[PDB]
Every structure is written in C-alpha cells, then in structure tokens.
Ligand binder design. Sequence first.
Ligand SMILES: N[C@@H](Cc1c[nH]c2ccccc12)C(=O)O
Ligand SMILES: N[C@@H](Cc1c[nH]c2ccccc12)C(=O)O
Ligand SMILES: N[C@@H](Cc1c[nH]c2ccccc12)C(=O)O
Ligand SMILES: N[C@@H](Cc1c[nH]c2ccccc12)C(=O)O
Ligand SMILES: [K+]
Ligand SMILES: [K+]
Ligand SMILES: [K+]
Ligand SMILES: [K+]
Lengths: 509, 410, 509, 410
Amino acid sequence: ADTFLEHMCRLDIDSPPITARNTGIICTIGPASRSVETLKEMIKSGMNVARLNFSHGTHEYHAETIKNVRTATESFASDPILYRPVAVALDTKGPEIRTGLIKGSGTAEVELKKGATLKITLDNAYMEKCDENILWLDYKNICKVVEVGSKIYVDDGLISLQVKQKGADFLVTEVENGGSLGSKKGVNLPGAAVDLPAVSEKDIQDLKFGVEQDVDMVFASFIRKASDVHEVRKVLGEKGKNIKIISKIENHEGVRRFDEILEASDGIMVARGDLGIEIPAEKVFLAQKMMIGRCNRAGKPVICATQMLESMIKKPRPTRAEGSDVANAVLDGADCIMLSGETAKGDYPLEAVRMQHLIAREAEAAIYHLQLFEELRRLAPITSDPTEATAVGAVEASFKCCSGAIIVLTKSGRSAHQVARYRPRAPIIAVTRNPQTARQAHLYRGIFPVLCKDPVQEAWAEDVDLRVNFAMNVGKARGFFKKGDVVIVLTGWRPGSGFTNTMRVVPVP
Amino acid sequence: ADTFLEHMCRLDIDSPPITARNTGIICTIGPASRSVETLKEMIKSGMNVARLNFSHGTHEYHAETIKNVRTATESFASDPILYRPVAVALDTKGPELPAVSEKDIQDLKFGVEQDVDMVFASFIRKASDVHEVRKVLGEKGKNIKIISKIENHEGVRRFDEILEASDGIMVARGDLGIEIPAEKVFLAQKMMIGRCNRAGKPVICATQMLESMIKKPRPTRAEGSDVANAVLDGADCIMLSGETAKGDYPLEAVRMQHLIAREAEAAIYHLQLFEELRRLAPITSDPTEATAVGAVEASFKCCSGAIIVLTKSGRSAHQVARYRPRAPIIAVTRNPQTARQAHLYRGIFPVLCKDPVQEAWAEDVDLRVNFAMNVGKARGFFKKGDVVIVLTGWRPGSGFTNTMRVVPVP
Amino acid sequence: ADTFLEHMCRLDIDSPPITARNTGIICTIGPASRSVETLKEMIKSGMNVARLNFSHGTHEYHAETIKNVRTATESFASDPILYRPVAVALDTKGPEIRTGLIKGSGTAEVELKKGATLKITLDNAYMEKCDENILWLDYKNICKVVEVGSKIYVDDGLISLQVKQKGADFLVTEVENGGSLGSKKGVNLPGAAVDLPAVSEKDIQDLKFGVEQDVDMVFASFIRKASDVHEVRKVLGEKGKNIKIISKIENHEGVRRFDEILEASDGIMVARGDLGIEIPAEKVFLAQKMMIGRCNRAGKPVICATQMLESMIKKPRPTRAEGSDVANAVLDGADCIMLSGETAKGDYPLEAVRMQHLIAREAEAAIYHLQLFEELRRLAPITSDPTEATAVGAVEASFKCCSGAIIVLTKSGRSAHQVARYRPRAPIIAVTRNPQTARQAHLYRGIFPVLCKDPVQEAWAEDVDLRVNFAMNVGKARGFFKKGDVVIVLTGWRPGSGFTNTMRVVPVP
Amino acid sequence: ADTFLEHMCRLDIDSPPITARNTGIICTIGPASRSVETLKEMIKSGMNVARLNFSHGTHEYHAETIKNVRTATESFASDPILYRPVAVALDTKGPELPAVSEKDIQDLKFGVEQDVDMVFASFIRKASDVHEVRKVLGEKGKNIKIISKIENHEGVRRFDEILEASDGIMVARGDLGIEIPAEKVFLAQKMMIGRCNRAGKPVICATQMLESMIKKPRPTRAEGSDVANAVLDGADCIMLSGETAKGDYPLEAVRMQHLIAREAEAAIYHLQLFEELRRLAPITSDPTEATAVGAVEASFKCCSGAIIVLTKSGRSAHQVARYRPRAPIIAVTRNPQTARQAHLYRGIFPVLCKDPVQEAWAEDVDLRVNFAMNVGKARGFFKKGDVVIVLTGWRPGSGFTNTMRVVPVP
Ligand SMILES: N[C@@H](Cc1c[nH]c2ccccc12)C(=O)O
Ligand SMILES: N[C@@H](Cc1c[nH]c2ccccc12)C(=O)O
Ligand SMILES: N[C@@H](Cc1c[nH]c2ccccc12)C(=O)O
Ligand SMILES: N[C@@H](Cc1c[nH]c2ccccc12)C(=O)O
Ligand SMILES: [K+]
Ligand SMILES: [K+]
Ligand SMILES: [K+]
Ligand SMILES: [K+]
C-alpha cells in the first residue's frame, strides 16, 4: 500500500487477521473478574492493565483485588519468555454526585416514566427511600449551582430531568428521558459550576493507599484544570513520584482547558459518554480526534474509555456498531482501550477481553503507518538532543530494512516511549530490569515490554548482548520475526550513559 | 494543516461549523414524513433524495407518496436560483432464491412508469443479479441508476464484479452485521467505500445511522460518531431509515444528519484524497479525464471557489467529483433527471437551467456560466473577484467536455 | 528516467540525437556571412536571429546587411508551413576603450614580448603609430581611474600589462603576457571604475537607426546598473517601445548589481570572456549558473555569448572542450547560444552554424525536464491571474496526456512566453499574425513560432480553429506529432478578452 | 535551497568560498615536481595522490621519485592531527595488441615491490583486460586498487563490464575526443561518471584540465569551467598531467585546481544527489549498508558537522560516501594504505591513528573518536557543542560497521 486509498481497497475480510494487536487493553476488575482463576484467563486473553474503581468498595476490598491480580500475573513468571507484565491502576472517586438507595423490598428498580414528575431532595430521611416521587442525592450545595430550566442526568446519562421549580432542599423536575433508576447512581450537571474540590478528603486517603499498595498509575477523575493535576501530584508526593497520572477529561471545562491539563499530566483518558452529556453529542467525535491527536503529537499516552462493548454486560458478543466505535477509536490514534462494566460486573468478562483483542487486532489492518510517522517527524521540533535523533532514525530504519522490531534497552522506559511517539509499524520490544517500568510501558502504543530477571554481567557489552538475545528469543517465540530478518537495537554507549544514543542494525540469528 | 495530524489537532469544537455540508442526504419517506408540509420542511433542512421502501405498501400508496414529494419539491421552483432538485429512489423488496422476484418485476415496471431516478436493488449477490435488474428496467428506464445493496457474505466476497456492473453501491451495515462477524463489518465498510471512491462510482451508507431518533429529538454520542466516521471513510451519501419514515421526529433527524455531515467536513483532509486518487488514476489521454484532472488540480492552486461543469448527462461532473476537490462542483444541466441523479455524488451541487437555448453557442454557454455564478454568489460559495474553473465542450454537439477556463467571478 | 542520475546512466552515445533542438541560435553577421546565398544556407541550417555588431561598420554598411538578411529570410515565405521567422539584433558599441593603428606599411602586427616595456600615451601624434615602444588608446581619463601596479588587458585579453609609473598622458607598463598586437583592439581595466557614460553620442545615433531599420532587439553593451537600461529605453522611446532590450553583463559592477539590471531589462546576455577578464576566471562558471538561473526564474530570456566555437574561425570542426562548454551552457538553462567570429569573419561560417545545432541537439538528451518544471512551479509566486494559472495547467497537462505540443494563439507573444517560463518538454507552437512577435519569440527556449498570413474571419471561433489547424499542419509536417496524438491549445475566450485563459485538450485530426 | 534553481539563484560570487574542497586532487610527478621541497609545497597546497607515468623513465628513476614523495609526505608526520596521507599511483604504458605487454608485467611487479596504492591501467578495452591486470598484481598486490582508463570506443561501448571488473574508472577526455566524435564526449563523461556514482566506485577525470598552466601562472576562463563541470558531473578526483609534471608553474597548478574544486562545491546541490542515490540503491538489509544510509540521512537532519567512520579497510567509509553526504566523512584508520587509498572517494577526509591499541575495546573506540574530534575541531569542520555521527563495529573483530551513534562534540 503506497497510498492510503490502496490500503483500504486491499482489505480482505476473508483472509485471517495476520497482523498482531498493537494497543493496550485496560480492564476494570470487580465482582465478576476478581478471582485468581478468572484474572489468569483475562491475562492470557490480553489484559495489560488492571483498573480498580475506588468509587466503590473499601480499601480492604481493593487490597485483596490487587493481591489476586498479582497472584494471577506471577503464575506465568515460571516462563520469563512468555511472561507478560500486568499493571495496576487506581481510579479516583473524584467530585461525585450520587443518588440514594431505592425504597423497600424486591428489585432495586423504579420505572421513571417519560414526562412524569420527580422531587430531588437533600432530606436524609429519604436517603434510602428513592422512588418515582422523591429522589435523594449527596450534593448538599445542589440548589445554589443549578437554575430553573437546567438539565440533570442520571446513571451514565440514561435518564434526564429538567428543573421546573427551585427550593431550599427540594428541586421539582420533569423526567425528559425514561429508564430504570437503580440504587446509588452517578449524577451530572452540565454547565453547572460544581463547587466540590479536586481532591476530596476521601481521594487523599485513596491516593495514599495507592502509594502504599505500589500502583503503577492513577486515573484522576473530573480533571478541570492544571492545578487539579498538581494537587493529585502533591498527594502522591515524593514516595509515589514515579506513579503516572492519567487525567480524565469528563466535562466541558476539561475540554476547554485541555492543553494545560495535557502539559501537566503524564497521560489522558477521554471519557466519551461523560462528554456526550456535558457537550453536544454530534461534536464528541471531533473532541475525541482532537484530544487523541494532541496526545500523539505531545507523545503522551491517551486512553479511550466508556461505551466500548457495554452490550457484553449481558451478551456473549458485541453489536456491529460497538465494534466500529472501538475500531475507529484505535485508528483515531488511541494508545489503549478501556473496558468498564463489560469486565467489572458483567455476565461475560472473559469474552469481553477476547473481543476487545479481536477488534483491536482487526483495526491494525486498517492502520496506514507510513503517513503517521512522516507527519509526526515533520511536526517534531528539530532538536539535536541525541536520544530524539536516534529514536527518529530507528523508526526511519524500521520501515526501510523491513524491520521485524526495534529493541530498546531501557531502565525507566523513557527511551522506548520516545521511539513509540513516532509510530513505527514494527513492534517496540522494551527490555527492562525495572518491573514497574515493564508494567507502565503498556500505556504506549506498540511497546511490547519484557522483564530481564538475570542480574548484571560485569562486561557491559555482554550484558547488552544477553538482553538483546532475550528479546530475540521472545520475538522469535511471539512470531514477530524469524532467522534472517533484521532488527534495530537501541542502547546507551558505556554503563553510566545519560543518552540512549546507539543504533545498531542486527540480523536475527 | 500541511499534515493530517495537524488537521486533527486544530479541531476546535467551540467555533461554529463554518464549512458547508458536502455529502448527499437520503431520507426514507413513510407515515411520518409523507405529507406535503413535512416534505417541504425536510427539503429545506437538506433532503436530497426521497427513498421509497417497496418492502411495504401498495403501488397506489407509493404513487401518492411520490406525487407528494414532487408537489413539495416544486413549491420552491418559483426561484430557480434557490431551487434544489430532489430525487426519487425505488427500493426493491428483494428475495426474502432468484434476483428479481415476480413482485420485484412489477415494482420495477412501476418505477419506470413513475419516472424514478434510481433503484436500490436489494440482496445483490453477484454481477448477473445486477444485469437482471437492468433488463427488467429495460429500454425505457435505461438511464435509471442501479445502486446495488451489499447485504450478505456472498455480496462482500464478489464485490468487485458487483461494483463493475452497478452504477453505485449501498453498504447496509446492519444486514452485514448479521451475515458477517460484527468485529469485521467496519473493515468491509472501509473497503467498499474505498473501492467505490477509486472506481469513481457513488457509495451510500445505510442502516443504523440515527435510529435512536425514532423516539428522541437528538441522537446518542455513538450514533453521531458512527455517521461522521462513515463520511470520513469516504461515503458520498448517508441514508436515514425509520428515523424519517415512521419516527416521532422526522424533521429533527434530517437536521442532525445535516449537522453531523457538516462537522465531518472539518475533519476531512482534502489534498491527500486528491493526490492519491490522481496517482492511482490510469494515464488515459481521453480529453475529458485529462481536463477533469487539471480542473481539480487548478481548483487547489488558484484558490478556487468552485468548479462549474456544463453537463447534459452529468458524466462530466461525475469525472471531476471522482478526484475529490475541496471546492464545490456546480453541475449546470438542462436535463432535470441529470440534476436529480447528481446528488449521489459527493461535492456535486446541481443546478437546473430553465432559460431555453440561445442560437449562438458561446452565448448559451456564458448564460449558463452566469447562472452558476449567481447561484454561487447567493449560496456564499464565492464573491466578486474570486476565481472559478469552468468546464465546457468546444463547439455545439461536442463529444468531449474538453475545455477548461479560468474565470474571475464578475 | 524517474531520477536525474538514471537520466545520465541511460545516455547512449551510439544511438542518434533523436530529440530535436530546443534552444535559439544567434549568429553574428559580417564579411563571411553577409551575402544572400550564405544567409539562405545559415537560415536552413538553423540561424534564428541575425546579430549586427555596431562596434564596426557605418550605418550604410549595416542597412545593406539587414536588407540581405531579409531578402534571404523571405526567400522561404512562398511556403508558409515551412517558413521560419528570422530576427535582427542591433548590438551597441557601448563605452569602449580601444587602441590605435599599428605604425607604417606592411604587416599590421607588432610582437609584444614577455617581460618587455610599453608606454601607453594619449598624445594623438601616436594615434596611428602603435608599436613595441608606444601604444595609443582612446580613453582620455585613463590616468585617473588606474593606479600603480594595476592590470591592463588587450584584444579579448590576449595581452596583459602592469602599470609601473603613472603620468598626465604617459603610463609606463611591463608586458606580463605576450602576443601579436593588431590595430584598434579592445582594452579592459579590471576593477577600475570607467567614468564613461551609458549611452555615448554614437550609441544614441545607432539606436535611432535601429528603430528606423525595424530591428527586433538591442543587445546593450557594458550594462552596469538599472539606470543604464532605462537610458537605452528612453532613446528607443515611443516608436521602438516593443523592441526588446537584452542587457549584456560584461564586468564586475554588472554582476554585483545583476538583480536590478534583470528587473529593468527584457533579457540578459552573459559575456563569459569579458567577465573572465573583469572577474577571477575560477568564479565565472558560478556567475553564469547564477545569472542563467535567476533569468529562468524571472522568466526572461538569457543568452550565452563569446568563447563558444572560436576554433572554427580556422577549422571545419570544434575542439572537444568547446563542445562541452556549449553543451553545459545549454544545460545550465540558457535560452539561446550566440556565435561571434565563428560566423562573422571565419573561414567556415556555415559549418559553425551546423555544429552549434548539433551540440544544442545533443544537450537536449542530457536535459531532465520534469525537475525543471516542478521546481519552477513551486518557486512561482501564487497569483490567481488567469493567464499564469492556465499556463501552469497547460504545462502540467503536457507531461500527463503525453503531449506532442502546446499551441498558443498569441498576438504579442506574452502568453507563449508565460508557458515557456515553466519549461515543458513539448514544443510550444506560438501562432501569431504579428511578424515581429514571431521574430522575437526565438529568444525563448522551446518556443517554435509560426506566422499566420490568412486574414481574419469575422466569426471568432472559426478564426481560432483556422489558426489551430495551421499549427496542426506545421506540427505534422515538422514531425512534432501525427494523427491520433493529443495536443494542448491555449486561446482567449471571446474576441475582446484580456487573458489567454482557455485550455483545450485536442486530439490531432 | 529547497530547489536546485534556488541553489543557483543564491550563488554569490562576492562572498568568500566558505565551503571546503571535497574532491581528490591527483598530480603527475615529473621533472618539475620531483624534488622533496616542491612535493612538500604541493602536499600543503592539496595534492592527495602522486601519479607516476611509466610510459617514460626507468625503474631506478621512479624508485627515487617514490622515495622523494614519501620523504616529503612524512615531513608532516611530526603532527598527527595535521598529517595528511599522500597516495602513490602507478600508471601503465599500455599497448602503443595485448592488454598487458611484457613491459607492463615488469612495471606492475615493480608497483607491488614499491607498495603503490593504485594502478591506472591504460587502454582498457574489455573486462578480461582488467582480470589480466589483476592476476599480474596477484596475491601480494591484491589490495592495490585497479582504475581502468577508458581511452577509446571499445572502452565506452563495453563500459559496464569494465566497471563491474575494476575498482574504479578514469575518463581520459582527450583520448576519447580522438576516438569518438568531439560533440559526444561530454555525454560520455556524464554517463560514465553517473554510472560510477551509482555503482559506488570512484571515478577520475583526466587530461585537458589546466594545460595552459604549463606556461602560465593562471588558467583560462574555459579551463576553469571545464574542471568545475567535471566536479558537478559527479567526479571523485581531478587529475593534472603536464601542468604539474613538467610545466613552469607546478605549484600554482595545484593551488588553482584546489580553488576551482572549492568553488564547484558552492554549486553542488547535495540533498538531490543523496535522495536519488538512496532510491536507486537495491534494498538490502545487510547491516552495514543500512547503517551507512541512516548515517547520511541523519547527517542532514541533526545538521551534522561530520560522519566519523572507524574503518580498517575503508570499505565502511566508502559505503557512506556512495550516498554523497554534504558533511565531511572522517575515515579513522590504523592501516596507512587504507588512509592513502581513501582519497579516491569524494568527501572522505582520511586520518591515520598512530596511538597503539588499548585492550578495552570501547576505550580504543573512544580514543579514535576523540582523535577525529580533535582533527575536525582543528580543521574547522566543527566546534564544541556541534553534533556528529559516529559509525563503529559492535564487539572487537566485528564484520559489520553496524553501530550509529549521535555524539555531541566535547
Ligand atoms: N502493550 C501491549 C500491546 C502490544 C503492543 N505491541 C504488541 C506487540 C505484540 C503483541 C502485543 C502488543 C502488550 O504488551 O501486550
Ligand atoms: N449534493 C448535495 C450536497 C452538496 C454537494 N455540494 C454542495 C455544495 C454546497 C452545499 C451542498 C452541497 C446538495 O446539492 O445539496
Ligand atoms: N525558436 C527556435 C527554437 C525552437 C524551440 N522549439 C523548437 C522546436 C523545433 C525546432 C526549433 C525549436 C526555432 O524555431 O528554431
Ligand atoms: N579526500 C580529500 C578531499 C576531501 C574530502 N573531504 C574533505 C574535507 C575537507 C578537506 C578536503 C576534503 C582530502 O582528504 O583532502
Ligand atoms: K471513578
Ligand atoms: K427494501
Ligand atoms: K559591441
Ligand atoms: K600512460
């Protein structure tokens, strides 16, 4: 395919999906995916990062989830060629409006009827007496920020309401969109100024527990401005300074102030459904393409979250439209896809992981790599910093000497990230001794991390050759290349080296 | 935007949708959209082609629907600068087997009788299926366009023969979604749209566009993305089904489909589409193709506001559209069927010249060009002092549209 | 040849010069080429412009030369398909330092001996008494501009001298380079500021005679600055306002101030030998490539003059090095080559014209056209002037629909020149009714002018079709194309049209 | 200069010749240039290779010439930063018939005995002529480079086989000028130089360069143009004959040949030479070629002051030069024959490391790199804070030069 149009006209749907998957998979662990035996099966089927939603459960609960994730992860360590690192991600509650419990016995489900009437109250007598008439919620200051004629959304926006009359505690609304109101659901107020903090007293505890439990990354919720990110940084502090902060863009202020949030964060998560409420639905696809685009250019990773395969909560296979939606998010240029209820609580957590792999595998057929790189090279600011210079040449060479891989010997990952910024077709095999580095690597597109566990041989160049040989074995075993192919190898020069400034064209023996 | 990535990083969601819409809109007429007053409002809000689903209703029923469509369409004819052609499309029942059922043979003959512009032929499996539809339409309906619908696996596998036999293609995503693995349909769509762009035949995306607007006044986030990605994939038209046929908000469905298709043009990166299509084009020295290329080429350089094509059958205007200019292609035609059929192509804006013919050839030409100049000015496409490209024949009755002319807007 | 290097590696010296010649030939008429029968044979063999050197001869003499040129030219008019226009060029004397006559009877030749002594004097007693001791010359102010240790050159620089002592009239010099000093020869003063005017009392007469005789172009000598060109323009004045001024660059000031001279002139002539004296020899080749380059970009024509085939004054065939020198001047991007003594006075004027055609024919094999055009298009300032827009598209189309020609219907030539600026491979057939336009066309590279003599039909489009058909006949007859080929045709739209804004792809009937 | 035409329109003749000379200079030693004191002055002024014409003189005569060349050459060795290698070239009599006359067999064996770097083999007609010269030089002189001289028509016709058999080519313009039509020789020259650039073997231009300097201290305008166009054509070295061998101004001939070749580099447009040579290169994934490409590619981007190649045989430094970087190629070698032979290639600046080997491989490497850094700084090629590219092997005894390293100048 010398042209993008010819790359589309070749697309044969009957020939098998030969290209391997190249984007991270993030699964939300919960009730249906929390056992060691399941986690094992999800790790095999492609889970790369375990997401823990601290909107629910106690610290005790999550500690066990984390312990199970690692138990399952390390079950495969007895073969260091096929062992895959799995990361752990702490996802903050944030500023969150939630409803109360549904009243009485039986099913926790009231049918909110289209056009009907609904009183929103702050009277804690109704705290667990939610029904068709009255609805409690936890935002105490709600009557000050919200006005007459304002929209209110409930349960990832399934239900919508319009404020008809205000009060001290009561707010009288008319139910515009119907649905089944469940217990304790999430409540958005588009174009309200929610006076809640960036880091609640709870979030401060949850983040300290994150540091304690040695998490790899924080998914910081309802990020509105740069100073919100810096408050998350401070709480993680000195001890958790190498934990990656992914800011979640969930509202309008988020999108408007995006550039400052990106420059302050380690990466970005685009919550499409939350935006879909706070912004006009017809415009979210541009928001997604803009944010993913800017992140590709800045070389920070970006995740697509919400509304991926939600039909697999109840079904063993997704819809046509969900498959298209996910795939276009991969082509847009996302680094990872994130499953939520699909894996957390759904009836088919294992099949959700396998389809997310299937879809992300197919999308790579549609990706036209040479354009992504040439554009990213031309927009790159012309530094003669040796590492960036070498990363470019490595990718450039990866297309020419038809390369099967780019092998990066990297301690912190930084070098492997600088190569990935430029979007090579070839897999980037990041060889690291630091296991956190190996775990964090999954956030980047096309990095395949491996963990070298033999400790260091005195002779520098031998240590290097041993690690390269490890990556050669892994690659051969993964099908990435076979004897007679050629790979690129980035290293330092000498053992104290500041730069990864050494490019080396190596035939696979 | 010198790069495609920089074209995405510029995308400001707060600034209004300044670029005008460039892809056809096809609406399915039925119970909720069948009155003249509604049709009127849908035509204003952007309907370009009326689709009649002959899976349901009697011939008598549809005859009235068609008559209402035309009544509404012609309400605007009293201003020939702002009059917009509206097309009629007959959509077969199909096998539910042979390619043309005893019913379909009747329905197609009724199509010819009613002077439809295009047939959406269902469950097209192979090339010989298309040719059977052609034969039934026969001599009298020989200028009716056949859009083959790809609805099953055999359809996708044998696509190249179906495309080479058809006037255009419709990709029914939901039908494929059943017959094919769900995870693969998006590739099918990108392949089929791709091949059609290259062959220069039009392609339509149908089913599962804004189906939530059957009951709701606004679509979902995911529907909006789905439609928009179909436009970027490179579709020429989008087709609404239940949204407009029977739903509670037929008029708002048309307006959103316009809104979405308007926003998608911001995301389109035009210079790449053209340069790729030029490089893949087989080096003919057929004068019309040679001129169509140069016209598009010039449309980028002399920052052109339009390409005006004087075309009787449309063929010339289609050859320009194959090459995907950013500029609007104003197809000026005296044939009203040509003006109606034009909507199938992306970025063709057809206009209908009703002034009769002046004896002096070059005067007739200048009068038509001046008509397009007026329409363009009035539509905001360009203003005085801009430059447009003008394709014409050379001499009367000419076989080629082989005359390119760089004209300042007066 | 997709690359320029592959265009060189293809160059087969055994296969004949298949490509037709595409650059103008200018011959200097004089003693050996002044008869009608010779001029006839030179016109057949390829002369396109007759050059008359007004450094010598009276007005009466030249009037006859001009009359002979036209007699010979029009001999071929009895077939308007094969008739070729021939232009006439008046070449000014300029500010000129010259020596006196050699003393006495007999041989007009004194042997200036290497290292010897030579007095330069202004005493008109010695005006026709030049010898080994004393040498008269015509520059009265020579003692003011020249200093002790200064170089002085004589007779196209064959002889060189160094100033040892100054005086009022006398200047005592030491003869550095030897040779045979003849009568009245040319005397350069490198890095002197020669205080002479731009248009001498003589040049004013010669230019008025030019207008009188209906010349097509003036080759203005010793052009130093823009204001010198404008003085030549004023003298030619209203009546001779369509006579083209070619400025000759002959000295250092010329090269330094080139951009203003080019912007003021209709075209440029690069006198390599004259520069070779005023400038360091090793730098002239860069000057030539710069000046030719700038002229190609400005779209004004440029001529290479002096030191082409000078060995053919005495010999029937040139040297290897002369052939290379000429050919590289064509590849540099010159529009015309100019022969001097070779044709003016030499023993083989006819063979000099035929070799100059042979060489210029071979050079077109080495020319790589697609690069010239693509570069010239990218550097062209993005006007939306309809004529430039159409000229570009015409050339663009000339490569694609493998075109045999670009036919331009042009009254003044301007349209045909705008096409030629962009360097198509295809011949540009300029069809004009103005015979001066047809003559002046030869200054441009790749314009093949033809003169339509059928008078005008009232119907515009018929007139147009008749002219197009004339060019079709000429092209067929010249071998440029045959039936079934495709050509491009530029015209106006309507008879009052300002622009040549109509491009038309026409199969050859 | 983004375009070649803009590279010509910039050419300022008043600003000094800032770019350094980049093509080898070969001088013919003889009566007027045979003394140690002269040779010294020619080496300073830029002689890179001494040519000995075995058409005349006895073996005894030449032995002394060679001994004088080396005496003069090594006078500068007392500063290994500024020491420049000088090569010796044996130029056969040839047939004046078989390819190797009984004389030539003796002269070539004497060449091997005297440790010459290259043979200029005369009147080469076909490939089998080259192989006979190879056999005579044999095992002991197997690393002596054979430059075939093209002097006649058979030579030009059969050129491709001669090039594929030879180490390099010499184009004798005057000899061709007799055997071929004068008007065609310039094409022959451009063809042969072109093919040699593409094959990556070196090519020399000989005869009719500055012949007027036999008697005069300065050349003609036309000689200067002739030489300069030979450099732009793409020659690697220029060769002076009588100018330096017997003429009255041998030293000034060398200085002008430097002056001209210095000016020609202003006119050279490098980015085109490289991109063309890369696109025509057969896409091997042999690690050395892969790295040579990337090195040149990087040399334009990280605006590099040099490409430093640690090379034992030169082969690596030659593979970089094939691709025509603007940057100087500093070939660092311990083999003095390698350093001498390097001058045949365009843009290689060889240096001779005389410090012996440190046991630690990477230290040895760093010491050589540091030597080239010192040389470059001292030659003005770059200063502290610039960035250079460094090619090396990976372990000791490595077969590939497969290690590219972007290094700031300390
Ligand atoms: N980062 C993920 C996905 C991935 C990137 N590149 C790959 C190459 C092969 C397989 C998977 C991948 C992983 O390591 O699994
Ligand atoms: N064919 C459609 C869409 C379209 C094409 N080109 C356009 C230019 C402007 C506006 C709309 C269009 C129409 O005429 O409406
Ligand atoms: N104008 C010149 C040179 C020329 C340009 N294009 C040509 C094509 C053919 C012959 C000559 C030419 C001539 O007529 O002689
Ligand atoms: N090879 C020659 C010419 C040369 C190539 N690159 C150079 C850089 C600088 C000076 C000279 C050169 C030398 O070393 O002298
Ligand atoms: K959360
Ligand atoms: K149907
Ligand atoms: K003169
Ligand atoms: K010899």
